[PDB]
């Protein structure tokens, strides 16, 4: 899409409708005449365009109105309402831009943001842009959170997020023009090498891949058309539905063999009965012929009854001889059918040990995408966010994806090595208690109007709590936290002195020997300028490789690679790093997934702010004081960087409306 329509699409907005959000800020317009809505819709789409065409400079309301043109540059307050709505909710003037109008020396309100992750940084940068006082509390010695980047010398490799999932409607597309990010395309050609190290032949590779995709689509059929979504009062997982679908296909193979063979016995039996007719006819013809001979032996001249007996037996013999001839003709047809029916017998297996092993690699792929064993994903909902996928190829960041957080974090008050330990929110404001990670004795107290929490879902899940809420979070929020899933996947980064792989392939697989170890180093990435090869640990393997020493883990990598390129072309690696995210106390996992028994509605529960009760009883109900952002709070874009960033922009808009006031609703 191009034009002003492209601006709406590139802002994840319908170009010809008003969203639920705009209905709320402009209820006059949505309930008004259609002509005015087109005017609004145009003014919105146009303003978005102006921002997108140059996102390195602030888009003032004046510059916006000047480059509008009649009748659209007529109602100046409608334009001022549109620009103000878009600025507030981070659809324009978000990210890193040059401020035309410098921010006011006098701030307003105080916000403490927990976590300098992308969600935290995005909100912070926005609030500061709105004239508030923001301070971020960070437990680590760096920003970024799950956006980690190994750097030593020229070696660069992301242990965290490393892929930009298409730029078609991606807010990262704006950050990419605002930050010098080296975006590189990813070639989808992934060759699978089996346990021995021999490339899987292409024909087998395509039918397993085809079958895998068929199996998936099958589960969706079980879910939606057959309502196979509860089993024994427990919710069905994707893994269970795959097992049930594979079983029902292995059963069909067996059914179709029985039906085939059991149709050989159908004919072999009517063959048997044909022979018994023919072996008796042959004995009746053996006996009549003998009688005819004896009647023929009485030499003529004979009385007519003896002439009758010859001509009669001769009749009867040719009669039965014509009968037997037909049965042999009929017997050949049955013999042909048996020759054919045996010739085309249906396949004896649905899948075999070699076939299934390659299927396991496609399941590890899924387990990688969702950072969790397929046994935990909700069957109904695991794919609830696929309608909002972006367009374009998937990218990787050549210079290290940390360049984004580090960039956002400038101009911001970040306290590093500051671990929040308690969060107190009252009707009159909030205090956050943190400590120094380097020495736990130093204690800090931060007072503020509002806390924005971007604590990873796995931190929120921790029992006993790493962070105490005073008063404790209500049962609806805690329950959503338990129901939701926080998965795990780890990376092993391998640094060599020389490229020994195919440089024209970005990624190649390894097929595990067992179902259990299907995730164990199942996939490798060649993404960077330096000779660095990245190897994934996913599925049930992820949480188990975290109890094994790095040297053993690197060993297993070397073994894999030797099997591929020979014990000669694989040197010892210069530099080795291995992720252990579930162990990492500021993550306690990798990213969120729709657990079985959860749904995408829990993601919206996560994002509801908390409103403390009144201090004096009988006092009017207060403002909400505790807000949440991060990857687990955005229903339509979870478990991604762009989704974190979007959630930051969201709360910052929400908090500002609550504290600075929304003057764009009138």
């Amino acid at each position: 899409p191009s034009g002003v329509e492209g601006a709406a699409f590139q802002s994840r907005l319908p170009h010809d409708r008003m969203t639920s959000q705009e209905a709320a800020c402009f209820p006059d317009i949505i309930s008004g005449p259609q002509q005015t809505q087109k005017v609004f819709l145009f003014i919105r789409n146009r303003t978005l365009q102006l921002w997108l065409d140059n996102p390195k400079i602030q888009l003032t309301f004046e510059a916006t109105l000047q480059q509008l043109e009649a009748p659209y540059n007529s109602d100046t307050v409608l334009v001022h309402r549109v620009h103000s709505y878009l600025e507030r909710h981070g659809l324009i003037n978000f990210g890193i831009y040059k401020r035309i109008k410098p921010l006011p020396t006098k701030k307003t309100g105080k916000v403490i943001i927990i976590g300098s992750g992308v969600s935290g940084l995005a909100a912070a940068r926005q609030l500061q842009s709105f004239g508030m006082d923001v301070t971020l509390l960070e437990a680590r010695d760096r920003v970024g959170g799950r956006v980690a980047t190994f750097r030593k010398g020229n070696y660069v490799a992301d242990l965290g997020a490393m892929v930009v999932t298409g730029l078609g409607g991606n807010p990262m597309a704006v950050v990419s023009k605002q930050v010098n990010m080296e975006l590189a395309k990813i070639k989808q050609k992934c060759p699978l090498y089996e346990a021995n190290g021999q490339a899987v032949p292409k024909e087998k590779d395509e039918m397993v891949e085809q079958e895998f995709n068929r199996l998936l689509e099958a589960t969706s059929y079980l879910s939606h058309q057959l309502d196979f979504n509860v089993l024994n009062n427990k919710p069905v997982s994707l893994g269970q539905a795959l097992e049930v679908v594979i079983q029902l296909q292995e059963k069909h193979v067996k059914d179709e063999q029985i039906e085939h063979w059991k149709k050989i016995v159908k004919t072999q039996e009517e063959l048997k009965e044909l022979l018994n007719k023919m072996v008796n006819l042959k004995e009746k013809i053996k006996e009549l012929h003998q009688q005819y001979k004896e009647a023929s032996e009485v030499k003529p001249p004979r009385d007519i009854t003896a002439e009758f007996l010859v001509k009669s037996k001769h009749r009867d013999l040719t009669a039965l001889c014509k009968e037997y001839d037909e049965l042999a003709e009929t017997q050949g047809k049955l013999e042909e059918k048996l020759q054919e029916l045996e010739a085309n017998p249906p396949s004896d297996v649905y899948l075999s040990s070699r076939d299934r092993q390659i299927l396991d690699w496609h399941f590890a792929n899924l387990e990688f995408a969702n950072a969790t064993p397929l046994s935990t994903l909700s069957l109904k909902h695991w794919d609830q966010d696929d309608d909002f996928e972006f367009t374009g190829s998937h990218l990787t960041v050549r210079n290290g994806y940390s360049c984004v957080p580090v960039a956002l974090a400038e101009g911001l008050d970040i306290k590093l090595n500051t671990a929040v330990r308690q969060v107190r929110y009252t009707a009159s404001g909030c205090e956050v208690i943190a400590v120094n990670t380097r020495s736990t004795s130093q204690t800090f107290i931060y007072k503020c109007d509002a806390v924005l929490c971007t604590l990873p879902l796995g931190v929120l899940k921790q029992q006993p709590p790493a962070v105490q809420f005073v008063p404790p979070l209500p049962e609806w929020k805690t329950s959503a936290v338990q129901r939701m899933g926080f998965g795990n996947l780890n990376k092993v980064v391998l640094c060599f002195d020389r490229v020994f792989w195919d440089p024209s392939v970005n990624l190649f697989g390894h097929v595990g020997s067992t179902t259990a170890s299907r995730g164990e180093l199942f996939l490798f990435w060649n993404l960077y300028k330096a000779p660095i090869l990245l190897a994934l640990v996913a599925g049930e393997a992820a949480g188990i490789m975290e109890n094994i020493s790095d040297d053993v883990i690197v060993g297993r990598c070397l073994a894999i690679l030797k099997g591929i390129f020979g014990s000669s072309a694989v040197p010892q690696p210069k530099e080795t790093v291995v992720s252990r995210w579930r162990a990492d106390p500021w993550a306690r996992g990798s990213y969120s997934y729709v657990a079985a028994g959860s749904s995408g509605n829990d993601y919206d529960l996560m994002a509801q702010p908390i409103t403390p009760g009144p201090s004096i009883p009988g006092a009017p109900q207060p403002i909400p004081r505790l807000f949440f952002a991060g990857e687990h709070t955005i229903r339509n874009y979870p478990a991604t960087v762009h989704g974190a960033l979007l959630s930051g922009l969201r709360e910052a808009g929400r908090i500002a409306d609550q504290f600075l006031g929304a003057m764009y609703t009138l």
Partner: peptide, 4 residues
């Protein structure tokens, strides 16, 4: 998302 299956991510290929």
């Amino acid at each position: 998302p299956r991510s290929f």
